[PDB]
Amino acid sequence: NLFVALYDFVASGDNTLSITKGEKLRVLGYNQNGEWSEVRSKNGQGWVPSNYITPVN
């Protein structure tokens, strides 16, 4: 189901994705240890730290 950004995140190059607080996100998957999440947003697709997002219930 759908996700939201909890904080602003500035991409640090590579395939990380900048997101801003309140932004809607779709979660595509997790990394090798689960601490990063691959997400799809308006700005596009990339990785953000998992603790920056929460599923909306």
To the nearest 10°, report the CA torsion of 28, 53, 17, 26. 30
CA 38 to chain CA centroid, Å, is: 6
Look up residue 29 and give its DSSP letter: E
CA angle 19, 21, 35 (to 5 degrees): 60
On the 0-12 / 13-18 / 19+ scale of CB atoms within 10 A, 3 is: buried
Which amino acid is residue 33, in one-letter code?
N
Distance CA 2, CA 15 (A): 21
Which amino acid is residue 10, in one-letter code?
V
In this structure, what token pair is assigned to residue 40? Answer: 């799809």
Residues ≥6 apart with Cβ < 8 Å to 28: 37, 38, 39, 40, 45
* Class of the CATH-defined domain 1-57: mainly beta
Q: Which of 34, 1, 3, 5 is nearest to 17 (CA)?
A: 5
Contact 38, 29 (CB under 8 A): yes
Distance CA 32, CA 45 (A): 18
